[PDB]
Design a protein around this ligand. Structure first.
Ligand SMILES: [K+]
Ligand SMILES: [Mg+2]
Ligand SMILES: [Mg+2]
Ligand SMILES: [Mg+2]
Ligand SMILES: [Mg+2]
Length: 191
RNA sequence: ACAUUUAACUAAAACCCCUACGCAUUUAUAUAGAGGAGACAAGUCGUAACAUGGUAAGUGUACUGGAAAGUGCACUUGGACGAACC
């Protein structure tokens, strides 16, 4: 998270690859020499590219710093590209009541619907002996509620010496969805 | 609706009406189904309250929500503010 704003007269790094306001490459210069050009022409320096190992800073007028972000405000509006995926977690118990399982199963539908990743964990019920046969039958029982909407990303594993099972769900991908749709029609319509 | 008749040298005889009660009305029981409260017990999800209970609590009202509840507006103390200046 950054913004196209002036860095000020406090530079952390001694050597900077300074750039002119008109786009000319002034070349690497000492940190002190950078501030002299900020006063001689009353200009503010903005870090254009952080990624490069050599520091890159461009000195431009305040009006030029307004037009720049005014364009980053349109490019993102025109073509927004926010793809981070949130991860949600649930920790159930083998002996979880159905009423609580329908409440937690409806919460997974809201997350899936928001393209989130739902990590579900199941643990042995309080002083209850149970294997992994019916302890893994809760995932299939939750996934069934979301037939086409959801699919496994990971699969059940013995996270803690078998006393727990962990799975991760995701919203079905567009292509996968279309494939599911196609299959659904054949079973009923063709018959 | 219904009618003064016979009789009368002692005096008597004769008498006999038709309409109501209902698909009205009162109350209660029984029955499909739905839903409360309580006892027993203390499974499931949380942790709402009691300590400034971890966002002080509560009243009334409104909206909202798996659930205790949450929030807004006004009100209360059945909260507090540490009690000389500095
Ligand atoms: K409260
Ligand atoms: Mg509490
Ligand atoms: Mg509280
Ligand atoms: Mg209140
Ligand atoms: Mg709310």
């Amino acid at each position: 998270k950054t913004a196209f704003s002036n860095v000020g007269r406090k530079i952390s790094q001694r050597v900077i690859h300074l750039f002119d306001e008109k786009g000319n490459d002034l070349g690497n210069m000492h940190r002190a020499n950078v501030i002299r050009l900020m006063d001689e022409r009353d200009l503010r320096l903005v870090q254009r590219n952080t990624s490069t190992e050599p520091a890159e800073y461009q000195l431009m007028t305040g009006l030029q710093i307004l037009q720049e972000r005014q364009r980053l405000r349109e490019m993102e509006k025109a073509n927004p590209k926010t793809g981070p995926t949130l991860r949600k977690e649930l920790i159930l118990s083998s002996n979880i009541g159905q009423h609580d399982l329908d409440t937690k199963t409806k919460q997974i539908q809201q997350w899936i619907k928001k393209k989130h990743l739902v990590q579900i964990t199941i643990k042995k019920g309080k002083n209850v002996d149970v294997s992994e046969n019916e302890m893994e039958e809760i995932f299939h029982q939750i996934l069934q509620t979301m037939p086409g909407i959801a699919t496994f990303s990971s699969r059940p594993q013995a996270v803690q010496g078998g006393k727990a099972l962990m799975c991760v769900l995701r919203a079905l991908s567009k292509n996968e969805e279309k494939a599911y749709k196609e299959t659904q029609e054949t079973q009923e319509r063709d018959t």
